[PDB]
Design a binder for this molecule. Sequence first.
Ligand SMILES: *[C@@H](C)/C=C/N1c2cc(C)c(C)cc2N(C[C@H](O)[C@H](O)[C@H](O)COP(=O)(O)OP(=O)(O)OC[C@H]2O[C@@H](n3cnc4c(N)ncnc43)[C@H](O)[C@@H]2O)c2[nH]c(=O)[nH]c(=O)c21
Ligand SMILES: *[C@@H](C)/C=C/N1c2cc(C)c(C)cc2N(C[C@H](O)[C@H](O)[C@H](O)COP(=O)(O)OP(=O)(O)OC[C@H]2O[C@@H](n3cnc4c(N)ncnc43)[C@H](O)[C@@H]2O)c2[nH]c(=O)[nH]c(=O)c21
Lengths: 380, 384
Amino acid sequence: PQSTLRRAITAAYRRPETECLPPLVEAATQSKEIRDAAASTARKLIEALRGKHGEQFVTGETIREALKRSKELEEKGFSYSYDMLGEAATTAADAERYYRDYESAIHAIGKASAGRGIYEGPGISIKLSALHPRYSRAQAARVMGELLPRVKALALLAKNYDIGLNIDAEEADRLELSLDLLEVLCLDGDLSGWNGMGFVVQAYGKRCPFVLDFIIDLARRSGRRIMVRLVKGAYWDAEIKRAQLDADFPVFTRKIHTDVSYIACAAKLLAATDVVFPQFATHNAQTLAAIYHMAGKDFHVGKYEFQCLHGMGEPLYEEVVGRGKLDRPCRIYAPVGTHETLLAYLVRRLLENGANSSFVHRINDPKVSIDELIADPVEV
Amino acid sequence: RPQSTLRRAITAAYRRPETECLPPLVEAATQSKEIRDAAASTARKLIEALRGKHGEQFVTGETIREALKRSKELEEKGFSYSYDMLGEAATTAADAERYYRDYESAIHAIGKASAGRGIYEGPGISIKLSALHPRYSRAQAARVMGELLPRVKALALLAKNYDIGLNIDAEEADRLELSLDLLEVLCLDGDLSGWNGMGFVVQAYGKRCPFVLDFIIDLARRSGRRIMVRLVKGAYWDAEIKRAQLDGLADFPVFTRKIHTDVSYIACAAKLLAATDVVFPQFATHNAQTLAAIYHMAGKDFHVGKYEFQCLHGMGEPLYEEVVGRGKLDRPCRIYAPVGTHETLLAYLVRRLLENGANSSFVHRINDPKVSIDELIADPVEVV
Ligand SMILES: *[C@@H](C)/C=C/N1c2cc(C)c(C)cc2N(C[C@H](O)[C@H](O)[C@H](O)COP(=O)(O)OP(=O)(O)OC[C@H]2O[C@@H](n3cnc4c(N)ncnc43)[C@H](O)[C@@H]2O)c2[nH]c(=O)[nH]c(=O)c21
Ligand SMILES: *[C@@H](C)/C=C/N1c2cc(C)c(C)cc2N(C[C@H](O)[C@H](O)[C@H](O)COP(=O)(O)OP(=O)(O)OC[C@H]2O[C@@H](n3cnc4c(N)ncnc43)[C@H](O)[C@@H]2O)c2[nH]c(=O)[nH]c(=O)c21
């Protein structure tokens, strides 16, 4: 099981950052016309954002509460991806409870979807670390064989309701295990005809483009239109600190390299909308504007969508969704759970929202101009 | 070996099963029925005041200049301050020396502002040893002691020159031993004689806490220094749990039941309050029940310099507004004031998030509708 696509992923794992960049810079360079139009859109979005000035990140405690609070934005053009927030299960009983929480959430979301299907209707997202009691500490062999039956059962339930089921991306050293899991699922005949299988790839990772080449080819040969959520990445501080402890990082160390990687990978995804459903997860108005223009004038629901986190993205995406704005859909990621189960997620939201490098921090920073906010990362 | 019995007891507690550590803590933490009743009354009053009257709020200022200016208001009210030039986990040798210079310049600025108020009434500084050595948590204790001790001694000399407090913050449990050896060497150094501003944090969620306290009290006696001892419950609980599991340990260095840390804290406070001749106990807590318990445990005789409470800026001022001052409890409180930009502060803010957001934290429970004042004033000695 060492195809040329899989070898390319494994070969990029800790490739020197300096060598990772030129392909990304070239794949991320857009025409002057697209850059100019994206700068104009980005400026307009940012001017709207600056115009109108952890509970905010939790949609509700139960899926029933989250579903009721979602109708308002759903009729404005938003969709949802619900996550029964759990992660880093340390016990078998914890992994079982999270599973039964995901299982019952799928039933509630599936019934609420009511045949809207994978693009117009809500979906679910899961973290594999919630479903295996020693996900980060167990060898991939034993982790695959105990986790695959559980994810399959969830994917079959999502298939039964025709909703999306997305596998979230966590630490860099679990990418390979989750990727072999996605391949087995996309080749499993019990899930045939269902295009709701989803997968996150993190653009701060040096493997991201090769992971996308692998997934694009996997979608094309398997006949599954894989939903690929492109995120920049939530675990940067932790990847750096694990790398320094265990000296080539699996992630970029300059934020701008992640930004270039994201755009490069978005171009690759946008060229493959026949076989994958790109889901561009970002709160960065510049990133959004670039993807919006990179995608061209042709759009239909199901071609691609944007995504955001609940409590972070609605002010930006209220300038995007709907016929009076940009008429592009956005799926809101909806964490569901108690405050205790979501602490680790809120920590990551603190790291994301509080970093001087984050768009969402800079947009409130009176030292940061709009010209700086609309800068094209490749140019910089 | 010097202090062999006390040192062996620390090592012995490191590995002690949690259930074995608890009975002695419970025995020291049990107070009289008249005291428990007074403590419950005081804690009720403190909590009803809090619930009844009321993340950049944790940072006092970006410079020690703005931090020192912002201190006059609550100092006139009777608070004092301990500044930290927010820095930790030096990832480079240049980073350590930079932190050192910022600490050095901060002591000069804090010392000038103190203007001779002394180590109790005037401001002090707190430092994290991980800011002053590159790869502090990774390099050996040979090169740590040999390069950190000269750096902290210089800082301690400057603080002595200005007669201000200099407190060594407590970090991960695996750094406790080297920090304790450092404290001992400084307290025995004649160059620092006559200055009682040397301070040291001990974390009550650690199994070693009462025995570290025995060692420090004993060090205070044989050195002639009146060591300032900041008793905290501990800021790294989630990290310690995760490190112990990843290091493969079968038993943790910290307690795993929050109420065990609460009993540990009260038991350690009792030990400290019986040694105020040779240590200056500094009770860092935002838990009104903990505070009430210590308040009545200390007795009715009080003078500034006997002990103090401490709190973190942005967390403790509402509670200690009900403490400081003749009209309230008439006990002092030193506000810990982090100084810095966004870098290094985010790591502090994460620890504040894990503290302010945990279902077991007092500051979370005080804002939780499902938690009654009854549960909040409950004595952990009795429930354990
Ligand atoms: C489980 C709950 C996982 C969810 N999942 C997810 C799903 C959705 C729908 C969305 C919107 C996000 C996530 N998610 C978080 C995501 O990674 C972050 O939101 C994203 O990184 C933010 O990027 P963006 O809005 O474009 O902001 P910005 O332009 O500010 O970029 C910040 C970004 O840059 C990287 N960074 C910061 N500093 C550096 C340095 N020094 N070097 C390199 N890179 C750097 C960081 O990535 C930072 O976040 C999410 N993340 C994830 O890893 N896996 C998932 O499954 C999700
Ligand atoms: C560098 C900036 C270091 C600062 N230092 C310090 C200095 C001052 C002046 C003050 C006030 C605090 C600290 N500091 C943080 C301190 O440890 C926490 O504030 C403290 O732990 C909070 O406790 P308290 O306010 O009394 O709240 P509460 O009753 O809620 O207890 C919370 C506490 O309980 C422990 N806990 C949580 N969960 C468990 C479980 N399951 N089992 C056992 N124990 C458990 C935790 O300790 C939790 O925080 C500080 N900490 C430090 O370790 N070192 C330092 O130098 C400081």
